[PDB]
């Protein structure tokens, strides 16, 4: 029981955290591109005005 | 679509070169077909060169000094499945990729537990097992680069695994489990306070059984100096010393006699080179210091017999047949305290302004 | 749907609009450098106390 809890705590502290930071970083990469596409959207929808 | 599939197609060839190595270790039971393997094998070798040339910009002070100014598990595990690849020039590529990957992470220990640690550890073991028949001497002057590159790619495997264990023992902050502790078989509770598993195969069981092979010591003296620095470090960390010295006394009680016997005999062989004598005398220091912690904390009946019948052999015992030797003085003169009179390099007289550029401090 | 529109007939308003909404994109890029660099100071202050 003591082993199997350390085994599961390693999965939380190393692998799951490695997935969490890869998703945190990938959120920033998507938020910068949400601003890229919305700046280009406002230029496009306001063109000739 | 075609602007994520680049690295995706490279990873599929690392996976498919494991599908193929599993299929070829099966189909060598039938294949007259070697001519068709080579394009897939060399494509796999070039992929493992190219990934190494993406790491060899981050294996660099200028990049880390730039960072100071501004799921890797599947990739690492599909590379680790190639550790026992049928071409040593692919095996050594997988092991040297894993070396760089541990330098950035110190977490290949958990990435191997979080996967199948048995199917991974057994591939390191399968590369650390000594085959005495893979041998013909490097005494011939006619060093063909083709045949030599294959023999280099072979014998570099155990040296790179030993140096991967050594790195993950030099880089310990106290109580941290590492890829060294994983390869040596320290308890998968991450628990450096618990004993080793007896009769098990880890890299530790192989390190000690290769050290006590006299032909392994004669053939590979620098690998034996390195192996003894592993034994010494595991015996001198304030946590693992108790599991380690207990495991030496429970599965290897001869170790401090048979290792001094083999090293002293390997030094006694005249016509050896200064660089063999270097490593065997270095290895002999590690045996003395590892024995010194065992005497200090774990003094046993085998240690009392070792000191009183071999190291300090009291004269009256010589006349009882009812069961040059290795005594304190015969050990001293095996180290040859005529030190070499180091001549000053002639280059320091050509470039006196560059002495501290032309040296490196080992620390 | 944006990067398939014609570049025809662009005006003084559109040129300065293309200049200023790309300045807004540059602001988040230049913020994220400073967020990373200032974390690249905090983490070292924390390491220095913990040594």
Swiss-Prot record, chain A:
Job of this protein: Probable component of the nuclear pore complex, a complex required for the trafficking across the nuclear membrane.
Residue stretches in coiled coil: none
Compartments (UniProt record): Nucleus, Nuclear pore complex
Superkingdom of the organism of origin: Eukaryota
Similarity comment: Belongs to the NUP54 family.
Taxonomic source organism: Dictyostelium discoideum
Domain notes: Contains FG repeats.
Span of the entire protein shown here: 295 to 343 of 440
Protein name: Nuclear pore complex protein nup54
């Amino acid at each position: 029981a003591l082993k199997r809890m350390r085994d599961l705590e390693n999965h939380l502290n190393f692998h799951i955290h490695t997935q969490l930071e890869m998703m945190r970083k990938k959120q920033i990469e998507l938020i910068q591109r949400y601003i890229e596409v919305w700046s280009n959207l406002e230029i496009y929808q306001s063109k000739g005005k | 679509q075609s602007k994520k599939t680049t690295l995706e197609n490279i990873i599929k060839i690392i996976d498919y070169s494991n599908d193929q190595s599993i299929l070829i270790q099966q189909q060598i039971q039938q294949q007259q077909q070697q001519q068709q393997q080579g394009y897939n094998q060399d494509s796999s070798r070039v992929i493992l060169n190219l990934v190494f040339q993406q790491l060899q910009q981050q294996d660099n002070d200028d990049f880390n000094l730039l960072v100071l100014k501004c799921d890797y598990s599947r990739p690492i595990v599909s590379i680790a499945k190639l550790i026992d690849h049928e071409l040593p020039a692919i095996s050594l590529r997988a092991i040297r990729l894993i070396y760089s990957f541990e330098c950035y992470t110190h977490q290949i220990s958990t990435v191997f537990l979080d996967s199948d640690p048995n199917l991974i550890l057994s591939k390191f073991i399968k590369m650390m097992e000594f085959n005495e028949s893979n041998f013909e001497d490097f005494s011939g002057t006619n060093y063909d680069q083709t045949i030599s590159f294959i023999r280099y790619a072979s014998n570099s495997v155990q040296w790179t695994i030993a140096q991967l264990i050594m790195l993950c023992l030099s880089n310990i902050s106290s109580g941290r489990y590492t890829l060294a502790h994983f390869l040596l078989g320290c308890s998968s509770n991450l628990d450096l306070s618990k004993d080793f598993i007896p009769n098990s195969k880890s890299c530790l069981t192989l390190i000690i059984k290769n050290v006590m092979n006299s032909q392994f010591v004669e053939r590979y003296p620098h690998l034996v100096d390195c192996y003894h620095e592993i034994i010494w470090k595991m015996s001198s960390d304030p946590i693992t010393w108790k599991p380690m010295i207990k495991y030496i006394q429970e599965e290897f009680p001869n170790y401090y006699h048979d290792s001094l016997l083999i090293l002293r005999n390997a030094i006694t062989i005249n016509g050896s080179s200064e660089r063999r004598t270097e490593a065997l005398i270095s290895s002999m220091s590690w045996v003395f210091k590892t024995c010194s912690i065992s005497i200090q904390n774990s003094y046993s009946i085998e240690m009392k017999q070792f000191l009183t019948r071999l190291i300090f052999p009291s004269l009256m015992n010589l006349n009882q047949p009812s069961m040059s030797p290795i005594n304190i003085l015969s050990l001293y003169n095996t180290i040859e305290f005529q030190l070499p009179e180091i001549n000053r390099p002639r280059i320091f007289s050509m470039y006196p302004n560059l002495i501290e550029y032309f040296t490196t401090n080992i620390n | 749907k944006i990067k398939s529109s014609p570049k025809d007939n662009e005006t003084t308003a559109d040129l300065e609009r293309e200049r200023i909404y790309s300045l807004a994109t540059k602001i988040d890029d230049d913020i994220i450098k400073v967020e990373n660099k200032l974390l690249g100071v905090v983490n070292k202050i924390n390491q220095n106390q913990v040594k």
